[PDB]
């Protein structure tokens, strides 16, 4: 509940002074992140998924979540109902401190950092990004891990337009290079 | 020559040709030849009718064909008995109702278009005539 | 929406209640209220309607629409129903899951003397 208290009063009046919200229910709120690590190559071997989940294993509360294939694809060598990816639906209250673990301290851990894009939207105004690796998180020490495992990190706010989701990222010092 | 691209059924029934035209009058161009008799036109008849009609103006304007065969009509081989299966396809006729505008031309003098379809009328089997562009 | 999507779940019970033509016991759950009605098999007339919305019934509790307040009107409705001589209803889920308050509404209606 660290940055939500900064969201609770300072950001809220910052929003209605920015876009003239007549109601306190139209100012956007972050609601979830999707910390999804779609490794993919684990179609032949199980442990390519199991350690990928175990390299994913230190963000949210508990064990690591498995996913399934949507359908069967010849080119990607898959059949229907196949354990391929591992994801996270970090919605609610346990996710707000994760941003400070990501948007503040994992930012200066990137190999040759320059910045993140500001033109990546779902059409409605919720930003999706994908980190190239996972080593920037504090939980990985490069001792027992073995991969440069990347993972899509999509933040979904209640922004009615594309600029507002850019602005709701901009209200919490996002690195717009 | 006209033939249905990627058709559905190879063999269909003979069928009857009853009724009048569900295509009313001049729509595309400005002058049309409307079939009066009732019957059918082979796809061989259409192209030779298209060839000689276009021969009059030689390039000028465009000629709007309002019809299409879309009907495989079969024939048994010569000197084989009745039945023994269904005959295979030979050629593709178009079921033609009375009062159906066959070909439409635009971009010609009025009198030149008269013989342009009249020479196309001799190639075509059924008796037919000329019509002008309809008003409303 | 969770309300209109709930309705199609209730329809299977609602189709069944009129297909076999039995008097039903309907529920409706509000954040601060609870509702309970008894509706005739003709499907357009409501016989017994006892909810917490009425001003003479809500003031028995502090917060209406919780478990003890839901049981406050569950006991009352069958008392009004048995005062019409009603002895057969089947409980309708109305799409609501039979675990929480709408179970506790049904618990008091079982306590009032009706059989379901």
């Amino acid at each position: 509940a660290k940055l939500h208290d900064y969201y609770k009063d300072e950001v809220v009046k910052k929003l209605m002074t920015e876009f003239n919200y007549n109601s306190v229910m139209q100012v956007p709120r972050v609601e979830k992140i999707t910390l999804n690590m779609g490794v993919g190559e684990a179609i032949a071997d199980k442990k390519l998924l199991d350690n990928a989940a175990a390299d994913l294993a230190a963000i949210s509360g508990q064990k690591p979540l498995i996913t399934k294939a949507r359908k069967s694809v010849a080119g990607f060598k898959i059949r229907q109902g196949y354990p391929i990816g591992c994801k996270v639906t970090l919605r609610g209250e346990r996710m707000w401190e994760f941003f400070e673990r990501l948007i503040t301290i994992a930012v200066p851990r990137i190999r040759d950092f320059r910045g993140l894009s500001a033109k990546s939207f779902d059409g409605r105004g919720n930003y999706s990004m994908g980190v190239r690796e996972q080593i920037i998180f504090p939980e990985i020490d490069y001792d027992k891990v073995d991969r440069v495992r990347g993972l899509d990190i999509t933040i979904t706010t209640t922004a009615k337009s594309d600029e507002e989701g850019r602005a709701l990222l901009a209200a919490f010092d996002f690195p717009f290079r | 020559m006209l033939q249905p691209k990627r058709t559905k059924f190879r063999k269909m029934h003979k069928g009857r040709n009853r009724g009048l035209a569900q295509g009313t009058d001049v729509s595309f161009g400005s002058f049309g030849l409307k079939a009066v008799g009732r019957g059918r036109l082979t796809a061989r008849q259409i192209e030779a009718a298209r060839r000689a009609m276009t021969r009059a103006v030689k390039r000028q304007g465009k000629i709007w064909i309002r019809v299409f065969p879309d009907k495989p009509i079969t024939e048994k081989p010569l000197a084989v008995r009745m039945g023994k299966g269904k005959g295979n396809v030979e050629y593709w006729v178009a079921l033609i109702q009375p009062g159906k505008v066959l070909y439409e031309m635009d971009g010609v003098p009025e009198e030149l278009a008269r013989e342009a379809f009249k020479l196309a009328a001799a190639k075509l089997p059924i008796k037919t005539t000329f019509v002008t562009k309809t008003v409303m | 929406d969770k309300k209109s999507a709930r309705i199609r779940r209730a329809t299977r019970a609602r189709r069944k209640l009129q297909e076999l033509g039995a008097t039903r016991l309907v529920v409706h759950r509000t954040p601060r209220h609870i509702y309970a009605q008894v509706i005739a098999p003709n499907g357009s007339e409501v016989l017994v309607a006892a909810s917490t919305v009425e001003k003479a019934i809500a003031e028995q509790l502090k917060y209406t629409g919780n478990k003890d307040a839901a049981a406050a009107v569950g006991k009352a409705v069958a008392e009004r129903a048995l005062e019409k001589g009603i002895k057969d209803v089947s409980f309708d889920r109305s799409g609501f899951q039979y675990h929480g308050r709408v179970q506790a509404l049904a618990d008091a209606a079982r306590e009032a003397g009706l059989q379901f």
Binding site: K2, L35, A53, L56, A57, A58, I59, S60, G61, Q62, K63, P64, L65, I66, V88, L90, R91, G92, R94, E97, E100, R101, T104, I105, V107, P108, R109, F113, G115, P138, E139, D173, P175 | - | -
Partner: protein
């Protein structure tokens, strides 16, 4: 929201080794001492 399959947690207190302290609840394990903070991340110059 549900029980028991969301990648593991453990509260630690951290402090970056540049005079800037970022001590929030984390999920690393026992602890970790950081090296670079946001305030020393060279995006300003």
């Amino acid at each position: 929201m549900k029980k028991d399959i969301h990648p593991k947690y453990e509260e630690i207190t951290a402090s970056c080794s540049c005079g800037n302290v970022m001590k929030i609840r984390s999920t690393v394990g026992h602890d970790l001492n950081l090296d670079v903070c946001s305030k020393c991340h060279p995006f300003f110059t």
